[PDB]
């Protein structure tokens, strides 16, 4: 009875386009736009995904309220991981008055991570930034006391947790596969770590954990419940910040002229004698523009999803209740009409005379837009500023593998930098 929306080619595997989505999601999404335009679809197992692109369609997507396009059940792969949410789990730590302190905390975490680097050596970006961001996230979003009781084990387990987000979750988040088994085992390991910390606290007597432990119903929360809360407080900001930091360093190393400009700027700026806690909250133009361009080319979330709660018409095409509706920062961020030479790294794109990020309000979307725009955006930008203010003034970096060999692993809904990502460092002098 109802007219079928345009469908992208391919998708003849068991679960439609799901197999291709797991192997090359960006290529799939780009083909949707190339073949069909601003509104096109692909099949994700038993669900149809209406992929929107372009300013007009994206505006509809981002301005829609939860009453029209619901985000609530659009990300099933998160249910097994976690086991009003922002107000309860994110807002407190993100208040403006807390930022100065967070910048100092982040600076401290970076110095601790590079304390044993010495004069020269080599690191792997995924291993370094994944661990560093576990410490900045836990210290800032949960507590310094809590972070001090964490070590490499927590980071290793958290990573396996993130790897348990295969697209098969859209079939069922509890299917019997290896990645989901490891996901549950990883979560169980985190619960054990938290339980140990709790017993240590109780053993010999205040942060967030101290408060949660004292809540009663007989203790109201188990280690599993507390662990779920902590996992949720750090998740949205961990893989995003980890990856963005890695790609920021990669692009600087790939474009030494920009790297040189950032170095000169940092040296001049800190010449006033103020701390990172002062400068990370204020303008650092060249670095900020490198970050904006890095986010445009390497958005950590390549697809955003919603579930339609009613019927809507976008450019003559009708979206029906129950349809999965999506927008893609990966595709939108590179629309050639909006971003001249979209595949090139051009930080000048954001300088005062151009401001391509502000002019393309509905297509420059690494942080999303509208009602669900990233609430941690300011924190994330401040964190990159604080991290590189320390790293780039203390050390010099060079690629230890071909520039084109650095890449992301897109096999899971949670994008992660692929290994190896070898980089050499040497103290500046």
Ligand X SMILES: C[C@]12CC[C@@H]3c4ccc(O)cc4CC[C@H]3[C@@H]1C[C@@H](O)[C@@H]2O
Among 72, 88, 214, 359, binds ligand X (CB under 6 A): 88
- State how far the Cα of 291 lies from the Cα of 251, in Å rounded to an integer: 9
Question: Which residues 6+ apart lie within 8 Å of 341 measured at CB?
Answer: none
- State how far the Cα of 410 lies from the Cα of 7, in Å rounded to an integer: 22
User: Any binding-site annotation on 374?
Assistant: yes
Label the pairing between strands 47-52 and 324-327. Answer: parallel
Least CB distance from residue 272 to ligand HEM, whole Å? Answer: 27
Instruction: Return the number of the residue (43 or 240) whose C-beta is nearest ligand HEM.
Output: 240
- State how far the Cα of 331 lies from the Cα of 29, in Å rounded to an integer: 7
Does 223 help bind ligand X (rule: CB under 6 A)?
no
Judged by CB under 6 A, how many residues of this single chain contact ligand X?
A: 16
Least CB distance from residue 352 to ligand HEM, whole Å? Answer: 22
User: Any binding-site annotation on 395?
Assistant: no
Q: Which residues bind ligand HEM (CB under 6 A)?
A: 71, 86, 90, 94, 236-237, 240-241, 244, 295, 299-301, 304, 366-368, 372, 374-376, 379-380
- State how far the Cα of 412 lies from the Cα of 164, in Å rounded to an integer: 8
Instruction: Return the number of the residue (84 or 343) whose C-beta is nearest ligand HEM.
Output: 84
- State how far the Cα of 119 lies from the Cα of 229, in Å rounded to an integer: 40
Among 27, 69, 43, CA closest to 309? 69
Question: What is the number of the residue whose Cβ is closest to ligand X?
Answer: 236
Residue 414: name its binding partner from ligand HEM, ligand X, none (Cβ under 5 to 8 Å by kind): ligand X
- State how far the Cα of 381 lies from the Cα of 218, in Å rounded to an integer: 42
Instruction: Return the number of the residue (7 or 90) whose C-beta is nearest ligand HEM.
Output: 90
User: Any binding-site annotation on 84?
Assistant: no
Neighbours of 175 (CB within 10 A): 12
Residue 367: name its binding partner from ligand HEM, ligand X, none (Cβ under 5 to 8 Å by kind): ligand HEM
Q: b/e per residue, 78-98, with b = 16+ CB within 10 A?
A: bebbeeeeeeebbeebbeeee
Q: Which stretch binds ligand X (CB under 6 A): 104-112, 113-121, 228-236, 332-340?
A: 228-236
- State how far the Cα of 87 lies from the Cα of 378, in Å rounded to an integer: 17
Instruction: Return the number of the residue (266 or 414) whose C-beta is nearest ligand X.
Output: 414
Residue 369: name its binding partner from ligand X, ligand HEM, none (Cβ under 5 to 8 Å by kind): none
Instruction: Return the number of the residue (243 or 347) whose C-beta is nearest ligand X.
Output: 243
Question: What is the number of the residue whose Cβ is closest to ligand HEM?
Answer: 376
Element (H, E) at 47: strand 47-52
User: Any binding-site annotation on 372?
Assistant: yes
**Residues 301-330 close enough to bind ligand X by CB under 6 A:** 301, 303
Among 126, 413, 417, 421, binds ligand X (CB under 6 A): 413
Q: b/e per residue, 384-418, with b = 16+ CB within 10 A?
A: bbbbbbbbbeebebebeeeeeebebebbbbbbbbe
Least CB distance from residue 81 to ligand X, whole Å? Answer: 8
Residues engaged in binding ligand X (CB under 6 A): 75, 78, 88-89, 208, 211-212, 215, 229, 232, 235-236, 301, 303, 413-414
Instruction: Tell me the binding residues for heme b.
Output: 71, 75, 86, 306, 372, 374
């Amino acid at each position: 009875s109802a007219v079928a929306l345009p469908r992208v080619s391919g998708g003849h595997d068991e679960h439609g386009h799901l197999e291709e989505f797991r192997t090359d999601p960006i290529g799939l999404m780009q083909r949707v736009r190339d073949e069909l335009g601003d509104v096109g679809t692909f099949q994700l197992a038993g669900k149809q995904v209406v992929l929107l692109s372009g300013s007009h369609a994206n505006e509809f997507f981002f301005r829609a309220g939860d009453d029209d396009l619901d985000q609530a059940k659009a990300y099933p792969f998160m249910t097994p991981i976690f086991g009003r949410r922002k107000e309860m789990l994110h807002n407190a730590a993100l208040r403006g008055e807390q930022m100065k302190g967070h910048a100092a905390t982040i600076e401290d975490q970076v110095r601790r991570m590079i304390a044993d680097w010495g004069e020269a050596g080599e690191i792997d970006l995924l291993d370094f930034f994944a661990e560093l961001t576990i410490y900045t996230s836990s210290a800032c979003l949960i507590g310094k006391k809590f972070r001090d009781q964490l070590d490499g084990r927590f980071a290793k387990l958290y990573h396996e947790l993130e790897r348990g987000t295969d697209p098969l979750a859209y079939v069922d988040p509890y299917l019997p596969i290896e990645s989901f088994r490891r996901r549950d085992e990883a979560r169980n390991g985190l619960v054990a770590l938290v339980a140990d910390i709790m017993n240590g606290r109780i053993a010999n007597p205040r942060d967030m954990l101290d408060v949660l432990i004292a809540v009663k119903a007989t203790p109201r929360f188990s280690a599993d419940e507390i662990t779920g809360m902590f996992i949720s407080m750090m998740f949205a900001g961990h893989h995003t910040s980890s990856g963005t930091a890695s790609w920021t360093l990669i692009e600087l190393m790939r474009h030494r002229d920009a790297y040189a400009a950032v170095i000169d700027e940092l040296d001049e700026l800190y010449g006033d004698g103020r701390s990172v806690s002062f400068h990370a909250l204020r303008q650092i133009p060249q670095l900020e523009n490198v970050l904006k361009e890095t986010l445009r080319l390497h958005p950590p979330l390549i697809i955003l999803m919603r579930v339609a709660k009613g019927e809507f018409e976008v450019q003559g095409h009708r979206i029906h209740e129950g349809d999965l509706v999506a927008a893609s920062p990966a595709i939108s961020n590179r629309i050639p009409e909006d971003f001249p030479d979209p595949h090139d790294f051009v930080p000048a794109r954001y300088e005062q005379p151009r401001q391509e990020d502000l002019l393309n309000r509905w297509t420059w979307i690494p942080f999303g837009a509208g009602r669900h725009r990233c609430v941690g955006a300011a924190f994330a930008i401040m964190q990159i500023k604080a991290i590189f203010s320390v790293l780039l003034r203390e050390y010099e970096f060079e690629m230890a593998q071909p520039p084109e060999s650095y890449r992301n692993d897109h096999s899971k809904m949670v994008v992660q930098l692929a290994q190896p990502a070898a980089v050499r460092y040497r103290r500046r002098t």
